Structure 1
């Protein structure tokens, strides 16, 4: 497959030139790497019908998902208490991220990271440059952990372990959280716990600030302020000047988003506060962040 590709040889040339790898051994690795046809079909898929909150929320706030989230919390309560004390990130949020990303380990990943990132970085032009950056960080992270690169698994796009970190997030955020010398986000829940918290804190999480606020609108023209995407463009003072009223009497000066969900029992208006934006840094989706925030609430409810 990648035995003698020109681009593969030019990737190995940059690896031995900017990061000091041994080209010969590096090209012995790529001889054992498989091009995954199923990955190409997956990422070649076109626009997939986005779901209404009415249908999206019940997929992730299920009795099974919550129940297993309390078990996960019970089992690692001491590491979660440690992560929340050191990083200022709520424990229910950490559990909820892991429960949403992998269902607490049930869906860690079906492909070898080396296959996924190679297939993409060398056989998918639209984002090849991106997935060759991740391939590079992955070879770097496999060297740092002294693990062998073919033993690591992940999603079709190369997200790894319980928190589904892509290689670059692994190198920049993952932490050795039980003091044993390794960073094992695949099967060491302690490192998963600490790694998610390090991610959130380093993406701007403010400890003690609320995440979301229920909102009302004075007029249907205020729906023109619904945020297209997850990037805020106004302060809360702006949005309120547009006809949005938050039940919470929160300060004006802060960047917010405005959301209109078609919920279980009618239209739902939400204002996403900065911390809510930190959740979307994990996956650029308004419904994702809402499912994570509410799931963390259900699990904290059921745990007591």
Structure 2
């Protein structure tokens, strides 16, 4: 509908046809109007972003580390039962909890029905919003949480776990058995739900997410791609070493790993294993997954990085990423579509251009690359 009420009355037909009952729908939509804050967040295309080292510095703030250590102690019994029932490490569950909602203190203060209805009505991604909105109404119908307390982010990520509704409906858990999968008010349900999702995503208990390594001179930096996986044994026989020199973790020699270079060839390097891939299913950002792994390590006194971060790491702005793609294509290094997203295709083009200049081909673009391109 053109008006929100028109859209709502029309959607009410689809909800009824989808199994939602009248009391639930009307209860859920009582007083609901579009939220301009949600529209703005949905439209937001940030010109500037922070370098990875600053993101990590925030994620690994000692205050978050110590709060996670406090949660590990406070909820030790539950975490033990969860760690044991789902075969997922407590430290990883708690790290995700820290990264997703600050252990439940920052869930958002937006009503999920209002936010998803707003996006359905006038958002850029109405298919997603409609689907999640129907899923949310089913959660209300089942009674996991009262409508008044169904809180989450502008995009519909809910509660302590920041599950979207369809993820809640497939992976949320009722830990205590009261019949409610309450990822808003129950740490037990939240922690078990997180573990269930990590396990479904392939978590292997006790296996490292990954670790920092040292690269040899003249290394083939084109190998730094999550789609490229090699047994640790193959990486070691290739020149890769433990971060302080020497061999890599034995016993794990058969495990498949990828090389991650979050700030290019001058920055630190990590080998990341299957459990890193599991974390990516929670949030598909390598920076996020690195933060989760290092935060989990930090609880036990690890998590800090031996290799120095490049001082000159000023990330390309959004318009600069678009400019980069256009400049690459102009020199015959096709990056695919010009969308401002540095994905696999663009990294391929970047590497070809770096090689043309005689630079290490790490696929990591910098202002200096853009400056060279526009001589």
Partner of 2:349: none
Whether the 8 Å CA contact 1:3–1:31 is kept in 2: the answer is no
Partner of 1:130: 128
- Check 1:68–1:36 CA distance in 2 against 1; reply closer, same or farther (3 A cut): same
Question: What is the CA-CA distance between 1:242 and the residue it aligns to?
Answer: 11
Aligned length: 292
The counterpart of 2:160, out of the listed 162, 165, 169, is 162
SS in 1 for 2:202: coil
Asked if 1:2 is matched to 2:4, the reply is yes
Question: What is the CA-CA distance between 1:56 and the residue it aligns to?
Answer: 1.5
Question: What is the CA-CA distance between 1:57 and the residue it aligns to?
Answer: 1.3
Partner of 2:300: 300
Provide the TM-score with structure 2 as the length reference.
Answer: 0.71
Whether the 8 Å CA contact 1:2–1:33 is kept in 2: the answer is no
How far apart, CA to CA, are the structure 2 residues paired with 1:81 and 1:48?
44
Question: Which structure shows the bigger proportion of residues in strand conformation?
Answer: 1
Whether the 8 Å CA contact 1:222–1:242 is kept in 2: the answer is no
How far apart, CA to CA, are the structure 1 residues paired with 2:114 and 2:234?
46
- Check 1:85–1:30 CA distance in 2 against 1; reply closer, same or farther (3 A cut): same
Question: What is the CA-CA distance between 1:30 and the residue it aligns to?
Answer: 3.6
Structure 1 runs of 4+ with >6 Å offset: none
Once the two structures are superposed, the pairs formed by residues 138-177 of structure 1 within 5 Å of their partners are 138-145=136-143, 147-177=145-175
How far apart, CA to CA, are the structure 2 residues paired with 1:209 and 1:289?
15
Partner of 1:248: 249
Whether the 8 Å CA contact 2:24–2:141 is kept in 1: the answer is no
Whether the 8 Å CA contact 2:209–2:276 is kept in 1: the answer is yes
Question: What is the CA-CA distance between 1:259 and the residue it aligns to?
Answer: 1.1
Whether the 8 Å CA contact 1:222–1:243 is kept in 2: the answer is no
- Consecutive unaligned residues of structure 2, counting only runs of 5 or more, are 242-247, 303-375
Provide the TM-score with structure 1 as the length reference.
Answer: 0.86
SS in 2 for 1:20: coil
How far apart, CA to CA, are the structure 1 residues paired with 2:184 and 2:217?
49
Whether the 8 Å CA contact 1:66–1:295 is kept in 2: the answer is yes
Partner of 1:217: 215
Asked if 1:185 is matched to 2:187, the reply is no
Asked if 1:16 is matched to 2:16, the reply is yes
1:180-222 Cα shifts (integer Å, max 9, x gaps): 2212111211111111000101111122332103334345462
Question: What is the CA-CA distance between 1:52 and the residue it aligns to?
Answer: 2.5
Partner of 2:90: 91
Moved more, 181-190 or 80-89: 181-190
- Consecutive unaligned residues of structure 1, counting only runs of 5 or more, are none
Moved more, 211-220 or 52-61: 211-220
SS in 2 for 1:168: helix
Moved more, 28-37 or 269-278: 28-37
Instruction: Kindly name which structure, 1 or 2, has the bigger radius of gyration based on alpha carbons.
Output: 2
Which structure has the higher relative contact order (CA within 8 Å, separation 6+)? Answer: 1
How far apart, CA to CA, are the structure 2 residues paired with 1:192 and 1:282?
14
Whether the 8 Å CA contact 2:88–2:198 is kept in 1: the answer is yes
**RMSD of aligned alpha carbons:** 2.7
